[PDB]
Amino acid sequence: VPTVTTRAFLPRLATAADSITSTTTTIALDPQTEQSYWTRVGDTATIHIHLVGAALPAAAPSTRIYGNFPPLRITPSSALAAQHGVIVPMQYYVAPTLPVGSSAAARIETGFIELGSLLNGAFTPLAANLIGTVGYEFAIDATYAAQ
Amino acid sequence: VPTVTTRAFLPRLATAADSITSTTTTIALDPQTEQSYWTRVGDTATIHIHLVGAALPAAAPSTRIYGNFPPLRITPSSALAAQHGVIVPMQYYVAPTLPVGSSAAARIETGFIELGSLLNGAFTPLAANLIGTVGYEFAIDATYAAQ
Amino acid sequence: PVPTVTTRAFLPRLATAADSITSTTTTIALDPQTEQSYWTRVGDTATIHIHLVGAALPAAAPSTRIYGNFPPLRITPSSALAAQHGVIVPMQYYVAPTLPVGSSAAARIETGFIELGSLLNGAFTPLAANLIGTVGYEFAIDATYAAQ
Ligand SMILES: [Cl-]
């Protein structure tokens, strides 16, 4: 018999040297303006993330969101590459710099959510100094199955 | 304990002078061919909207859908701009005219759903005379958390 | 009534066809798979995860489809003179396909099957089976929709 659980949470923005390592640097957050939350009913998780900041993080190849949202159900893939995840679009209120022809996207993994871009079905991580213009403001909305 | 509610509903197509105003014009609908519906289980809402019409509405800057679907859960934003919402793709069976490089999209807000286009994560409202060719036919499919 | 939750692994069946309407299909022999495909349904809300990998592209055909026991999409059946109306979603490629210029990778979810294709100005176009990869293929489809 299903339960429903709905919680506000505080996403943690963090950067890393690549899309594989568990070593990260936490980015200090300005005061936020829009509540981030998640809900889970049965094994179905829906997340809403919004973050705003006045200054872009220092340059790093991987830009991630951590938090207590339900962990994605997916078979763990090879440790030699980024873990397989679910690719979703995302929204920018302040313009990022994306590769030509690509759309704004995020890779939802069991361990974290990575910001990036999408072209011909392929996800490419977005560097932390390119996720906005001077500062940043973006949102991620998605539904996926939890473990 | 969660409940499940699944209902057919009659979407209302309406246009407005901008993406903020509460002044709207309801568009008279042709007989519809496909059932529009929503379902809510716990706080998770899934909507299916389909509308067909033989003649495009009179040109207006904002094209909106109203109905009794579960209201989006999101922090209300400034009244000086369109309310923050969830951006989703949408489907056209009759071709629209979109900005170059953009994808067909919809902005789901607590108050209504707005048709538009999506480029580099940014949503732009689509004018009512551009949502088709002579006539129109489109669908919007999404899942989001409700209040 | 009170909602139930059902979560199940499943074995997607890859099939090709001569168009996007016909019930005539050719089942494609699958390699050993590396990632579990599954679906879950709570109330009338279905979420699917499909992953398929193969060393060799299927023989060329205009429609590339996935069949399985996932919850059937709730949608009014449309004219038999065209592909059934469905829900269009994005999809992911681990091995590069050949898509129409300017289009994004997409899938069309129908009550009867899921079809691979591309998306441009809101319009879905089916993708031929000899173009769903390079030499071989590897892709994933993730979606949530209402079931009947
Ligand atoms: Cl089968």
Using DSSP, how many helices (H) and how many strands (E) does chain B show? 0, 12
Strand partners, B7: B38
Contact A114, A76 (CB under 8 A): no
Could you give the CA distance from residue C42 to residue C60 in angstroms, rounded to a whole number? 38
Find the CB nearest A46 among B2, B121, B143: B143
Could you give the CA distance from residue A105 to residue A98 in angstroms, rounded to a whole number? 10
Residues with CB under 5 A from ligand 1 (ion): C 13, 67
Burial class (CB in 10 A: 0-12, 13-18, 19+), C118: buried
Cα B99 to ligand 1 centre (Å):
41
Contact A95, A108 (CB under 8 A): no
Task: Identify the contact set of chain B against chain A, taking CB-CB distances under 8 A.
Answer: 1-2, 41-44, 73-75, 77, 84, 86-89, 101, 103, 118, 120-123, 143-145
Contact B8, B37 (CB under 8 A): yes
Q: Do B144 and A46 touch (CB under 8 A)?
A: yes
Phi, psi of C83 (to 5 degrees): -55, 140
Q: Do C44 and B91 touch (CB under 8 A)?
A: no
Could you give the CA distance from residue B33 to residue B74 in angstroms, rounded to a whole number? 32
Beta strand B37-41 with B24-26 is: unpaired
Q: Do A41 and C96 touch (CB under 8 A)?
A: no
Cα A2 to ligand 1 centre (Å):
28
Q: Which residues of A touch C34 (CB under 8 A)?
A: 75, 77
Contact A50, A32 (CB under 8 A): yes
Q: How far A86 CA lies from chain C's nearest CA (Å)? A: 7
Q: Which residues of A touch C138 (CB under 8 A)?
A: none
Could you give the CA distance from residue A132 to residue B58 in angstroms, rounded to a whole number? 37
User: Looking at this protein, which amino acid is placed at residue B81?
Assistant: A
The residue behind tokens 């059946």 is: C77
Q: Comparing C-alpha atoms, which of C4, C133, C131 is closest to residue C60?
A: C131
Residue C134, both tokens: 């390079």
Phi-psi sector, A44: left (phi>0), alpha (psi -120 to 50), beta: beta
Q: Do A48 and B118 touch (CB under 8 A)?
A: no
Method: X-ray
Resolution in A: 1.9
- Looking at residue B129, the DSSP 8-state letter turns out to be G
Q: Do B44 and A48 touch (CB under 8 A)?
A: no
Cα C146 to ligand 1 centre (Å):
20
Could you give the CA distance from residue A138 to residue B49 in angstroms, rounded to a whole number? 26
Q: Do B103 and A98 touch (CB under 8 A)?
A: no
Contact A51, A57 (CB under 8 A): no
Question: In whole angstroms, what separates CA C20 from the centre of its chain?
Answer: 12
DSSP assignment of C32-83? PPSS--EEEEETTEEEEEEEEEESSPPPP-SEEEEE-SSPPB------TTSP
User: Looking at this protein, which amino acid is placed at residue C91?
Assistant: M
Q: Do A86 and C38 touch (CB under 8 A)?
A: no
Cα angle A130-A111-B76, degrees, rounded to a multiple of 5:
60
Residue C119, both tokens: 């998306």
Cα C11 to ligand 1 centre (Å):
9
Cα distance from N-terminal residue to C-terminal residue, chain C = 15
Find the CB nearest A89 among B43, B77, B87: B87
